[PDB]
Amino acid sequence: KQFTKCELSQNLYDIDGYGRIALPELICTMFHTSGYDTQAIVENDESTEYGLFQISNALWCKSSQSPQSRNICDITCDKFLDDDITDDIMCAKKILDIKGIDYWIAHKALCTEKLEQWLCEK
Ligand SMILES: [Ca+2]
């Protein structure tokens, strides 16, 4: 499932100021990250990143591809490919708590200027 900008900001409302992050900032980031597609799958070196949040199996979830993964979010990477982004969000919170938003390269890159384009309400 692909989200529209507003449908997502909607579902992620209670994330604003979460860890001193700005919603628009985070929306901007997801856009460049997966284009808001829940089924986004990206193979990197050996490893892969999954879902809207493109959370890596090198460290965050468990995949047969990287048995040695620390599986910090303690979940199978397959859970990041369904139409329920709840679990995804819990993993995302975990990343934010431990790593920070710089886990996502698009942040520093393009989402710290004109986050205007990233607001919705109507
Ligand atoms: Ca999910």
From Swiss-Prot:
Q: Which cysteines are joined by disulfide bonds?
A: C6-C120, C28-C111, C61-C77, C73-C91
Q: PANTHER family this protein is in?
A: ALPHA-LACTALBUMIN, LYSOZYME C
Keyword field contains Calcium:
yes
Sequence ranges assigned to domain C-type lysozyme in this UniProt record? 1-122
InterPro entries given for it? Answer: Glyco_hydro_22 (IPR001916), Glyco_hydro_22_CS (IPR019799), Lactalbumin (IPR000545), Lysozyme-like_dom_sf (IPR023346)
Q: Which purpose does this protein serve, as stated in its record?
A: Regulatory subunit of lactose synthase, changes the substrate specificity of galactosyltransferase in the mammary gland making glucose a good acceptor substrate for this enzyme. This enables LS to synthesize lactose, the major carbohydrate component of milk. In other tissues, galactosyltransferase transfers galactose onto the N-acetylglucosamine of the oligosaccharide chains in glycoproteins.
Gene Ontology molecular function: calcium ion binding; lactose synthase activity; lysozyme activity
GO cellular component term, pick one: extracellular region
- What are the glycosylated positions? D45
The molecule here is called Alpha-lactalbumin
Q: Which family does it belong to?
A: Belongs to the glycosyl hydrolase 22 family.
Q: Where does Ca(2+) bind?
A: K79, D82, D84, D87, D88
One GO BP on record is: defense response to Gram-negative bacterium
Assembly mode: Lactose synthase (LS) is a heterodimer of a catalytic component, beta1,4-galactosyltransferase (beta4Gal-T1) and a regulatory component, alpha-lactalbumin (LA).
> Keywords, A to Z?
Calcium, Disulfide bond, Glycoprotein, Lactose biosynthesis, Metal-binding, Milk protein, Secreted
Annotated compartments: Secreted
Report, as the record phrases it, the tissue specificity of this protein.
Answer: Mammary gland specific. Secreted in milk.
Does Lipoprotein count among this protein's keywords?
no
Q: For this UniProt entry, what is the primary localization, expressed as one broad class?
A: secreted
